[PDB]
Symmetry: D2
Subunit: 257 residues, 4 copies
């Protein structure tokens, strides 16, 4: 079928990409980086993220495969030829992970996150009111906030004390970054896990400029009126050719491998 | 309909229970603590837990209401007469929360938890292997482990650094109690959120005696071979007469009220 | 004696400053903001920090007093006239708190911190090697690091999970900011408390530009070769007119007041 | 000089102890387990703790050496003969670490801790008032409290989120065990580091029976009126024959070795 391969850019990944394309030339596989049905990422998780955002507008028409040269990449380089044959056969199972939708309104722009989306200030102190489903939950003071996807809970979310979360759970998790808690300032302190259809809105208090990140992209937004977080209706689809449970790759990435 | 009322036992709750029974006598309400269709709890969360476990074998035939004299109790004492009329009218919406199933096998006994279930040792050091869906995830060394329900995430789970979790998410959360992490001993460190159909099994390493708790009940189990945690097929049903969102009562219980 | 008063700049603090100067005019007190022996700060902790850094080169010749209009400010506005008389009498006890010395070398500039000093990157990822007394302790990957004074442990340090620390202990505390811990990346995770004469050196790995903060001042340093942290030989002296223990003001600021 | 050797009891440590005694027989070394001037511990940290408590009443007359068969034990088994010669020469430097004093009053018994001392309840809920230097600081509700020595900060204290602490700092650290924090219950949350001459007193609220631990010893105390924690006037003396900094053995025990 139609496919393309992205590369980390280093010498090891470029030649591995060339060898796979040559192997695909022995099958009925058409290279097409405009409308690929399979997107193969050769590199680290950052390479996989760049591949996801490159084709973030054809998610319901693409299955992703990562090659580790790696949390999202679940294929070793020595298994590259076996992946070529299995991918050429065309018999695989489709696994879908939830995504996070971020909406920024001024006085709007929407983004899509596979890992997480964070909010910080433009230099000054970070103060926002957290509104959950039109209900004011807290006034947050600290460094920032992090809204994570299920697969992203093992990333930035994990470093902030968040809980690890199985991707079969369509939900999002919010965690704090060095929150201020005293006699007057008070936040929940604990990570919050929100289901679908729940909308978390961050509203400015004084400063209206925020440094907002979506995965590896970070932009300084000015004159912000609202940042809306909610579980996206879009999902990322993975092409899986063998059993690799989520808790097993969590074990291999943090326990031992 | 059929109903019963349990009381904290103090003077304030006993007379409040008597006044509600007298008010129910003015309607077509039959008191029956054997097969009640409505179980009213008058007291704290501990009183509500005792009421839940008293009728834990007729959950699919009971709706619970708590009166705060209180996380589960969402009614003030001054609103008691209004609750009598609304309950007498019989028009309310049913809200269901997930529960936790605990299975203990020797060389079996099953329990049901509304808050959480924890495992500790019988005095010696606590060492168990954590097996997730027949896959060995880690070997835990520390004080103990806590498997929490969604509504219980704000209880013992919250004190252990766990994430707060909306009850619409049918799942369970596991957290650590003073885990040992060094060059040789290593655990995930982070809370784990497990969906339905996922089974978490704790298996002994040396000592086989464990102090196991289910909500307020704590028993010393001897010659233990396996402790199995999984989201229960049973659910607790609440009788709700007005909108009281989960994040609002989280706000009222921890932020301000 | 010689003295000066700094103000938060708002209407409440400016007129309070004018009333105290008029009260000092009834005594043998000479106003001198060039060589003051007493520096009175009227405002919040930020106002107190600005006053400290304004006279950070005459610390061994100045005693500080804060008026809360407030962790460092231990005087209420209604007690202003009583403070004028006691300060005019000249009989008070001197209390000294340790300070933090920060040295930045390029390819040097030194700073003095009353609260803490933090290091972040200039946009890219933050990776430094932590060298304790010429011994490589760890390679840190995350958001940043925070080296705090004893009195600053209740500030930014507290939000990062650090321990609260009595100012009689001449030492400094280092805490992590969202550290990365997996199979390959590994840090100590725990706050580190260093005594006097211990030198903690942060050395760059790839990027050499860092956003370094000292209390409220934050500057982007370029071509950095080493950031050295150590307990300063300089100490800040407070003028205390009544018993106000450190744990009592910790209680009043976080427990209840 | 006078000396004795304790053993872990296993086959590896017993024969190693026999070989060292035979090597000591070639020098002017008298074995005496009643009044030894050098106490050699062969085993783990638990073996070292048992050796410390065995001679806890002659600390100012004993230097300790640990052999790892190990945080306190800073000698490898293959270096045993070199230790025999150096110990026989008698030229070594003395390193002293602070200790923790625990006093329990009823309606008194004192203990000495090298690692830490913890308080839990006898089954019921744990509620105590924390009084720092005759000043009520907080009312603690949770699982328990842990008062640690500087060298013990890397032990139980580290698992509870406490800060690591250099032993040159004569002080003690208190940490919480699953503290309850809501709208009504509120604790400091953060670890507390207390200098010398500071007394921390835990006073009962309802239940007066507590399970108190001192290192590996744990006893159920009944009718308790006060538990007093303070830095002990006694210190443990180590016999050091080579440079092994505290942060280096922290690195070797948690980072890599
Ligand atoms: N202070 C901090 N602590 C921790 N992470 C921080 C962080 N600040 C930022 N981030 C992460 O940086 C990413 C920016 N692009 C980096 C590419 C990536 C990635 C990634 N995804 C996952 C995942 N889904 N599950 C588990 N591990 C994952 N990783 C690994 O995290 C490490 C990051 O280099 C590498 O090992 C990665 O393989 C962002 O999306 C934030 O998630
Ligand atoms: N060390 C610790 N820290 C924190 N909790 C611990 C704890 N050790 C034990 N437990 C809890 O004790 C319960 C034993 N019966 C107590 C009755 C109860 C309850 C309860 N349920 C919830 C809930 N679902 N959401 C939010 N708050 C809740 N509460 C409040 O928690 C406080 C407990 O007294 C009271 O305010 C309760 O109202 C157990 O089930 C453990 O959950
Ligand atoms: N993410 C975060 N979380 C927590 N603190 C952060 C933070 N980021 C930055 N900072 C602090 O900001 C200060 C920058 N100038 C603010 C003026 C100040 C102050 C101050 N000193 C102390 C103290 N010594 N003990 C206890 N409370 C203190 N406070 C209070 O902390 C609150 C800060 O507004 C106010 O209540 C202050 O009264 C810096 O020095 C960082 O210490
Ligand atoms: N839940 C928990 N988490 C963590 N520690 C807990 C714990 N509950 C209890 N304890 C510790 O158990 C000790 C009871 N006797 C065990 C013998 C011992 C020891 C010891 N001392 C230190 C030290 N000074 N610095 C760094 N590591 C140390 N170790 C290591 O800690 C591990 C304990 O087996 C072993 O690796 C030991 O080598 C007690 O004193 C509590 O300190």
């Amino acid at each position: 079928m139609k496919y393309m391969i992205t590369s980390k850019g280093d010498e090891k990944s470029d030649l591995l990409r060339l060898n796979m394309i040559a192997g695909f030339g022995e099958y009925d596989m058409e290279y097409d980086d405009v409308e690929p049905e399979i997107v193969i990422s050769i590199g680290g998780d950052g390479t996989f993220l760049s591949a996801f955002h490159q084709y973030e507008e054809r998610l319901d028409e693409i299955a992703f495969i990562g090659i580790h040269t790696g949390f999202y990449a679940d294929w070793r380089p020595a298994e590259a030829d076996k992946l070529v044959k299995l991918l050429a056969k065309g018999e695989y199972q489709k696994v879908s992970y939830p995504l996070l939708k971020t909406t920024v309104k001024y006085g709007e722009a929407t983004y899509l996150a596979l890992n997480e989306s964070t909010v910080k200030s433009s230099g000054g102190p970070f103060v926002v009111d957290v509104v959950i489903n039109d209900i004011h939950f807290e006034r947050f003071r600290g460094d920032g906030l992090c809204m994570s996807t299920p697969s992203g809970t093992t990333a930035y979310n994990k470093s902030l004390g968040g809980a690890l979360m199985h991707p079969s759970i369509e939900a999002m998790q919010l965690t704090e970054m060095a929150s201020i808690n005293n006699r007057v300032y008070r936040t929940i302190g604990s990570p919050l896990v929100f289901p679908k259809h729940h909308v978390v809105s961050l509203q400015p208090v004084n400063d209206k400029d925020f440094q907002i990140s979506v995965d590896h992209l970070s932009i300084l937004h000015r004159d912000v009126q609202e940042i809306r977080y909610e579980v996206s209706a879009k999902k990322i689809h993975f092409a899986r050719f063998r059993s690799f449970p989520f808790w097993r790759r969590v074990h291999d990435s943090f326990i031992e491998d």
